[PDB]
């Protein structure tokens, strides 16, 4: 597990064209919330 998803810590970079934080970190993110 891994809490920034909750809060969206590890993706915020980008933002306007939202979709380019990247598959496998908005995934890792995902994964990481499987608590």
Do not use: L, V, W
């Given at each position: ?24 970190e908005?995934?890792?993110?995902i ?5």
């Amino acid at each position: 597990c891994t809490r920034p998803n909750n809060n969206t810590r590890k993706s915020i970079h980008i933002g306007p064209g939202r979709a380019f934080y990247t598959t496998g970190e908005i995934i890792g993110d995902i994964r990481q919330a499987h608590c």
